[PDB]
Amino acid sequence: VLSPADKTNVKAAWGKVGAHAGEYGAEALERMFLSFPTTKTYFPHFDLSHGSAQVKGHGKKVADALTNAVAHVDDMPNALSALSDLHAHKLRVDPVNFKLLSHCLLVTLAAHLPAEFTPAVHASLDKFLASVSTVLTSKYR
Amino acid sequence: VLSPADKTNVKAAWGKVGAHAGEYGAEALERMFLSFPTTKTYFPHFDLSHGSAQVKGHGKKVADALTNAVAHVDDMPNALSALSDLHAHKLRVDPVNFKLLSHCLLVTLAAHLPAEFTPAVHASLDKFLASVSTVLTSKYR
Amino acid sequence: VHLTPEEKSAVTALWGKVNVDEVGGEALGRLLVVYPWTQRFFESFGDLSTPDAVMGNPKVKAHGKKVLGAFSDGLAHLDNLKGTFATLSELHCDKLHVDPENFRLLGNVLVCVLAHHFGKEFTPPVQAAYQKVVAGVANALAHKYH
Amino acid sequence: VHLTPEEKSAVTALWGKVNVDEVGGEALGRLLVVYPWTQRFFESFGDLSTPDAVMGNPKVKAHGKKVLGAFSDGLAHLDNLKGTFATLSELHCDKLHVDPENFRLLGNVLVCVLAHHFGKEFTPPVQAAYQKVVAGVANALAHKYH
Numbered sequence: 001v002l003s004p005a006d007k008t009n010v011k012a013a014w015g016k017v018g019a020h021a022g023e024y025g026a027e028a029l030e031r032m033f034l035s036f037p038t039t040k041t042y043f044p045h046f047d048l049s050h051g052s053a054q055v056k057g058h059g060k061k062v063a064d065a066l067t068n069a070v071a072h073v074d075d076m077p078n079a080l081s082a083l084s085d086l087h088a089h090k091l092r093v094d095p096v097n098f099k100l101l102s103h104c105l106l107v108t109l110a111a112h113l114p115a116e117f118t119p120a121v122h123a124s125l126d127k128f129l130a131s132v133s134t135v136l137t138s139k140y141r
Numbered sequence: 142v143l144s145p146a147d148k149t150n151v152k153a154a155w156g157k158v159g160a161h162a163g164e165y166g167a168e169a170l171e172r173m174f175l176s177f178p179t180t181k182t183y184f185p186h187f188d189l190s191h192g193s194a195q196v197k198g199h200g201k202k203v204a205d206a207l208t209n210a211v212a213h214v215d216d217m218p219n220a221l222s223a224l225s226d227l228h229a230h231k232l233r234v235d236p237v238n239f240k241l242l243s244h245c246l247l248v249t250l251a252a253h254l255p256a257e258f259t260p261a262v263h264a265s266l267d268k269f270l271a272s273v274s275t276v277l278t279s280k281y282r
Numbered sequence: 283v284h285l286t287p288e289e290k291s292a293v294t295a296l297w298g299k300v301n302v303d304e305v306g307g308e309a310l311g312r313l314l315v316v317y318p319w320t321q322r323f324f325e326s327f328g329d330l331s332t333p334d335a336v337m338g339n340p341k342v343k344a345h346g347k348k349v350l351g352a353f354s355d356g357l358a359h360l361d362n363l364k365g366t367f368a369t370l371s372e373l374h375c376d377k378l379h380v381d382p383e384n385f386r387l388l389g390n391v392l393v394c395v396l397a398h399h400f401g402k403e404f405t406p407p408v409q410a411a412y413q414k415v416v417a418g419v420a421n422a423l424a425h426k427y428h
Numbered sequence: 429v430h431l432t433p434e435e436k437s438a439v440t441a442l443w444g445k446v447n448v449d450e451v452g453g454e455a456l457g458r459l460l461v462v463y464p465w466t467q468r469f470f471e472s473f474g475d476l477s478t479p480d481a482v483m484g485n486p487k488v489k490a491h492g493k494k495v496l497g498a499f500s501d502g503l504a505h506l507d508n509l510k511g512t513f514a515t516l517s518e519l520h521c522d523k524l525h526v527d528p529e530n531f532r533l534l535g536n537v538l539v540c541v542l543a544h545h546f547g548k549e550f551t552p553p554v555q556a557a558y559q560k561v562v563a564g565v566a567n568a569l570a571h572k573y574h
């Protein structure tokens with residue numbers, strides 16, 4: 001469960017991401033595809049090379065979903081309901097991949113938040129991304 | 142989530158195990174320690190010799206906890222609360238190991254339930270063990 | 283990759299008793315039932331709408347047999363699983379776009395299927411040898427991914 | 429575990445800029461803060477009760493130096509990580525009883541620390557190369573478990 005401090009930390013860190021959320025989303029995807037090539041099996045229809053317009057556009061979608069989760073941090077199972085259904089039923093992405101993107105998102109935030117990405121904040125962000133991942137894999141079976 | 146159909150399947154399958162539970166718990170431990178030797182890193186203080194009475198005793202405890210969770214399948218967070226506390230705060234077993242014991246419990250049930258281990262029952266049992274595992278790792282951080 | 287002489291003989295002895303048709307159909311069918319997201323690769327197989335439909339599906343049964351036949355061939359190459367599976371690794375990566383986690387799931391389902399069939403004969407040591415095998419095969423199939 | 433030529437030089441170039449003692453204390457500390465069950469091996473280290481208690485803990489820092497020192501030495505042997513880490517693998521299994529999942533978690537924390545320290549210089553290709561390293565090191569440390 002996210003603690004009061006975790007939600008303070010997540011809100012403050014995502015606050016500092018600010019207008020860069022979409023850029024960071026795309027960066028995290030690129031990081032994931034390069035670092036964990038098995039994740040590319042879910043995107044055979046995408047251009048997955050550096051500077052891809054598809055990846056840039058998808059990063060914005062991922063970021064917006066995260067912004068929404070932050071705004072509804074106490075009701076993620078509902079706020080992300082449609083997205084959970086999409087991943088469980090339409091995309092059928094193996095649940096193991098969510099930790100891979102979560103790690104890539106954390107790395108991206110680390111690379112952009114020198115003052116903000118303290119150990120406590122790192123812990124809270126990791127918990128938050130794990131919780132989003134849990135919601136997104138909650139309807140698989 | 143465990144569906145009403147899952148709960149039906151779990152209760153019937155565990156009903157069939159009956160008084161063999163304790164034995165099956167110990168068998169699933171033995172299977173875990175042999176198949177996944179990294180799990181033995183949590184038991185260096187145990188006697189792991191063949192037929193170990195300490196392992197047998199422990200298998201009974203594990204089984205009794207599962208029997209209780211089945212009996213309280215509508216409210217497992219509360220039924221397993223003290224046990225969840227114990228794993229999160231005292232034992233501190235990495236969450237990754239719960240899937241390993243869960244698999245070994247499934248294999249044990251398969252080896253002892255020729256008639257009852259249908260594809261649908263297999264699915265429900267797997268979900269049930271994952272749900273137990275989820276509760277037992279819920280307080281880790 | 284390190285199967286011991288004693289593990290090797292355990293694997294081969296059990297395998298000599300395996301009905302690869304039945305076990306293959308059962309393992310692939312259970313994969314699709316227990317982890318239904320794995321059905322994503324098989325829309326062309328037709329009816330996968332219920333457990334009974336999946337299990338009895340002629341295409342699931344045929345593919346299960348084929349997959350476990352290649353697994354069986356692999357057991358002749360226990361010391362070089364990566365070499366023997368290299369072609370199929372590339373295929374599943376580049377042509378089929380199959381996440382290698384699927385191989386790991388199938389391995390564990392196959393273990394359940396063997397336990398279900400053999401009962402007490404699928405002892406803890408025999409299981410542990412088979413765990414080394416299914417891990418090795420899954421790893422070998424994942425090895426050429428890029 | 430196969431790094432390309434450009435990946436090997438990227439790893440080496442970045443590591444030349446790393447203060448190993450510092451980064452090691454930071455990575456071990458972050459491991460114990462982010463995944464607090466990992467504190468289970470360090471009862472003798474004293475106060476681990478808050479993020480600051482962990483991060484500034486002199487025993488945590490001292491241990492992080494030795495851990496990352498061994499890691500750093502291993503970067504000179506990327507083609508033989510299993511050999512390099514064999515005695516440490518045996519030690520962590522037989523004497524220290526450390527679940528190898530801890531090596532994986534530390535790898536990922538280390539990647540986060542490198543990103544935090546280097547900012548934009550920790551590019552997606554540099555990360556990809558370090559992900560190969562950290563996976564290879566964790567696999568090597570796991571390899572002699574039994």
Ligand code: HEM
Binds near residue numbers: 039043061098099
């Ligand atoms: C933090 C975790 C994740 C978040 C917040 C997220 C969010 C999203 C969003 C917002 C969409 C667009 C939905 C729409 O079209 O309405 C999407 C689509 C998609 N996602 Fe996820 N996602 C996550 C994890 C993953 C992972 C780990 C994978 C696979 C490695 C994945 C694979 C896909 C695929 C294949 C699509 C469809 C792309 C297309 O063909 O249009 N997602 N995701």
Ligand code: HEM
Binds near residue numbers: 234239277
């Ligand atoms: C289905 C999942 C599990 C269940 C139901 C379960 C249940 C239990 C129970 C009932 C106890 C005894 C508690 C007491 O004395 O009050 C226990 C203790 C313990 N468990 Fe778990 N457990 C599970 C998973 C695991 C896993 C995966 C591991 C590690 C591989 C583990 C390691 C331990 C250890 C080390 C103890 C303490 C043994 C001792 O020194 O007495 N458990 N567990």
Ligand code: HNI
Binds near residue numbers: 349352353373380385
């Ligand atoms: C859940 C997905 C999935 C898994 C776990 C899986 C697991 C495995 C394993 C693991 C032990 C082995 C040895 C294996 C072997 C094979 N697979 Ni896999 N395959 C999978 C999805 C496929 C798909 C999809 C095809 C093509 C099917 C078809 O008939 O078109 C396939 C095709 C094959 C073929 C046929 C290749 C050819 O055309 O010459 C072989 C052999 N395989 N597959």
Ligand code: HNI
Binds near residue numbers: 472494498519531
């Ligand atoms: C969280 C657990 C944990 C992790 C992730 C970890 C990860 C690593 C990694 C990973 C890159 C390396 C190279 C490594 C290297 C070392 N460890 Ni690890 N160790 C761990 C727990 C220990 C423990 C416990 C000790 C003994 C500490 C003590 O009290 O002396 C240890 C001791 C060492 C020693 C000293 C050996 C001796 O005392 O003879 C080295 C070197 N290591 N450890």
